[PDB]
Design a protein around this ligand. Structure first.
Ligand SMILES: NC(=[NH2+])NCCC[C@H](N)C(=O)O
Lengths: 89, 89
């Protein structure tokens, strides 16, 4: 039950999101990291706003720091975001 | 108590937030819109995960979208985030 923001267009994911919601999913998670986090809030915004206002709330938002491997076997840090949209209760 | 994420280097804003708490700030909000959001999360993470690991955490995170009167009689929407960090008591 999760849609990850990749290279595809923002509207490509609100599609994937609503699709899982259509297919039942009671909570769909919109995950992203790095600069793709802006596109993540984009998706969740267009969904709750433009398409599923009536019956879809933001259940919670949680952030974090993932780890990226560098040429030195050491690791960099990249912010991440998790937006869980749930069916309006 | 607010720090808006502009273009400035990350650290300038993290340091900014910190200074706020350093003065007693019992809660600070890292706001950003558009492509900045991702950088709004960088900040909030670095603060609660590194420079203030022992005395500050995420009290809550908010999202939304806003109108921006632009070219001609047109308004553009942009996503917005308001990460709230509170003092650990
Ligand atoms: N948890 C974090 N995002 N920490 C800071 C890394 C953010 C960004 N990738 C940078 O290095 O500027």
């Amino acid at each position: 039950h999760v849609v990850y923001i990749g290279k595809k267009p923002v509207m490509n994911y609100v599609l994937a999101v609503i699709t899982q919601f259509h297919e039942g999913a009671k909570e769909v998670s919109i995950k992203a990291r790095g600069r793709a986090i802006s596109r993540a809030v984009d998706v969740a915004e267009i969904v709750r706003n433009r398409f599923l206002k009536d019956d879809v709330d933001v259940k919670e938002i949680k952030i974090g720091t993932e780890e990226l491997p560098t040429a030195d076997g050491r690791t960099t840090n990249t912010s991440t975001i998790e937006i869980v949209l749930a069916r309006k209760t």
